[PDB]
Design an enzyme around this catalytic site. Structure first.
Site, PDB file in Angstrom:
ATOM      1  N   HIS A 190       0.759  -1.330   0.059  1.00 17.51           N
ATOM      2  CA  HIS A 190       0.132   0.013   0.069  1.00 17.51           C
ATOM      3  C   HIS A 190       0.779   1.263   0.138  1.00 17.51           C
ATOM      4  CE1 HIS A 190      -3.649   2.936   1.474  1.00 17.51           C
ATOM      5  NE2 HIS A 190      -2.546   3.393   1.955  1.00 17.51           N
ATOM      6  N   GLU A 191       1.819   1.397   0.914  1.00 20.49           N
ATOM      7  CA  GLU A 191       2.895   2.489   0.853  1.00 20.49           C
ATOM      8  C   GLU A 191       3.472   2.727  -0.424  1.00 20.49           C
ATOM      9  OE1 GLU A 191       1.837   4.173   3.191  1.00 20.49           O
ATOM     10  OE2 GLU A 191       0.923   2.640   4.404  1.00 20.49           O
ATOM     11  N   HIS A 194       1.272   4.131  -3.114  1.00 22.21           N
ATOM     12  CA  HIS A 194       1.323   5.715  -3.115  1.00 22.21           C
ATOM     13  C   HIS A 194       2.463   6.141  -3.723  1.00 22.21           C
ATOM     14  CE1 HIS A 194      -1.997   6.490  -0.690  1.00 22.21           C
ATOM     15  NE2 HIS A 194      -1.741   5.729   0.381  1.00 22.21           N
ATOM     16  N   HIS A 200      -5.602   6.763  -2.286  1.00 19.25           N
ATOM     17  CA  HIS A 200      -6.624   5.882  -1.749  1.00 19.25           C
ATOM     18  C   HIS A 200      -7.706   5.724  -2.723  1.00 19.25           C
ATOM     19  CE1 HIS A 200      -4.990   7.258   2.543  1.00 19.25           C
ATOM     20  NE2 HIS A 200      -4.403   6.133   2.083  1.00 19.25           N
TER      21      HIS A 200
HETATM   22  C1  LIG Z   1      -3.966  -4.870   5.855  1.00 20.22           C
HETATM   23  C2  LIG Z   1      -4.051  -3.924   4.890  1.00 20.22           C
HETATM   24  C3  LIG Z   1      -4.004  -3.159   3.880  1.00 20.22           C
HETATM   25  C4  LIG Z   1      -3.862  -1.864   2.779  1.00 20.22           C
HETATM   26  O1  LIG Z   1      -2.776  -1.016   3.555  1.00 20.22           O
HETATM   27  C5  LIG Z   1      -2.929  -0.038   4.536  1.00 20.22           C
HETATM   28  C6  LIG Z   1      -1.839   0.662   4.794  1.00 20.22           C
HETATM   29  C7  LIG Z   1      -2.073   1.503   5.693  1.00 20.22           C
HETATM   30  C8  LIG Z   1      -3.140   2.015   6.560  1.00 20.22           C
HETATM   31  S1  LIG Z   1      -3.228   3.345   7.382  1.00 20.22           S
HETATM   32  O2  LIG Z   1      -4.213   2.873   8.415  1.00 20.22           O
HETATM   33  O3  LIG Z   1      -1.799   3.556   7.996  1.00 20.22           O
HETATM   34  N1  LIG Z   1      -3.655   4.840   6.793  1.00 20.22           N
HETATM   35  C9  LIG Z   1      -3.105   6.156   7.316  1.00 20.22           C
HETATM   36  C10 LIG Z   1      -1.997   6.431   6.416  1.00 20.22           C
HETATM   37  C11 LIG Z   1      -1.789   5.406   5.466  1.00 20.22           C
HETATM   38  S2  LIG Z   1      -0.952   5.483   3.762  1.00 20.22           S
HETATM   39  C12 LIG Z   1      -3.194   4.899   5.472  1.00 20.22           C
HETATM   40  C13 LIG Z   1      -4.470   1.253   6.320  1.00 20.22           C
HETATM   41  C14 LIG Z   1      -4.206   0.216   4.960  1.00 20.22           C
HETATM   42 ZN   LIG Z   2      -2.570   5.500   2.454  1.00 24.20          ZN
END
Ligand SMILES: CC#CCOc1ccc(S(=O)(=O)N2CC[C@H](S)C2)cc1
Ligand SMILES: [Zn+2]
Length: 266
Positions: A190-191, A194, A200
């Protein structure tokens, strides 16, 4: 525009701070690198097999160029801060840093090494407020993009150096518990998503945020929904649109060939 074999890979700086080393690697170099090598492999698997045009524009991945393991806290003078120091910042009674301040500081401190890679990623072990697991700068197809893959630098007069926000971080601690490796796989995917230029998935677009009985959310959905559903380890069409334009634009610039070297970084 079809994939160049000599420019299909985003080389990655991997950093583990003393907290990750102590808690996840159990204070062993061997255990620490094993955990990170295997996580990046699993993340790379998701990426390479993603067809960003839903056709054949695929095979883009990530490969570790360096694994920098910090085995103890950074010594600091009063006033000074460093992403690897003993205390969390800005409140040392909290377990974790303010997570935005952490990414900013990691970016500043790791700048010399970040200048040499497509992406730099910090792996840490602290409980961020509101249950945050990761944070990263969002890439872009813009020629003057200042975040994510292959960004332009900001100069730091005080640091006498260029700073590159081609950075992000993952924590494998949440609510006091070590997360599952398959959960960790997803957060980092996920990171990095980005970094590659995805925002998102909006809970609005149902085709980009399918219901549970529809196969569940895709990886760029901003909440860690429990249970594993098929879509979890896939990129939505919303993500694919963004990431495709970003790659198409930036790969020639700072992507490299897939390789299995004996020694990386020489
Ligand atoms: C299991 C799974 C999955 C998908 O990846 C995610 C990553 C970060 C989050 S988080 O809660 O940190 N939210 C605040 C910042 C980030 S980038 C998004 C929420 C989901
Ligand atoms: Zn995110």
């Amino acid at each position: 525009a079809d994939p160049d074999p000599m420019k299909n890979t985003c080389k990655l700086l991997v950093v583990a701070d003393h907290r990750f080393y102590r808690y996840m690697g159990r204070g062993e170099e061997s255990t620490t690198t094993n955990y990170l090598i295997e996580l990046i492999d699993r993340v790379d698997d998701i990426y390479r097999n993603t067809a960003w045009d839903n056709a054949g524009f695929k095979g883009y991945g990530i490969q570790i160029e360096q694994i920098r393991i910090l085995k103890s806290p950074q010594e600091v003078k009063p006033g000074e801060k460093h992403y690897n120091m003993a205390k969390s910042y800005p409140n040392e009674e909290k377990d974790a840093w303010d997570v935005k301040m952490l990414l900013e500081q990691f970016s500043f401190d790791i700048a010399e090494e970040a200048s040499k890679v497509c992406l730099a990623h910090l792996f840490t072990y602290q409980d961020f407020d509101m249950g945050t697991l990761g944070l990263a700068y969002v890439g872009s197809p813009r020629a003057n993009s200042h975040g994510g893959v292959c960004p332009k630098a900001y100069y730091s007069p005080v640091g006498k150096k260029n700073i590159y926000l081609n950075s992000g971080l993952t924590s494998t601690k949440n609510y006091g518990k070590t997360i599952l490796t398959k959960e960790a796989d997803l957060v980092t995917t996920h990171e990095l998503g980005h970094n590659f230029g995805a925002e998102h998935d909006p809970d609005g677009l149902a085709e980009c945020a399918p219901n549970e009985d529809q196969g569940g959310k895709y990886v760029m959905y901003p909440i860690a929904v429990s249970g594993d559903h098929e879509n979890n380890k896939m990129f939505s069409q919303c993500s694919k649109q963004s990431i495709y334009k970003t790659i198409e634009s930036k790969a020639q610039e700072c992507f490299q060939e897939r390789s299995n070297k004996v020694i990386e970084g020489r």
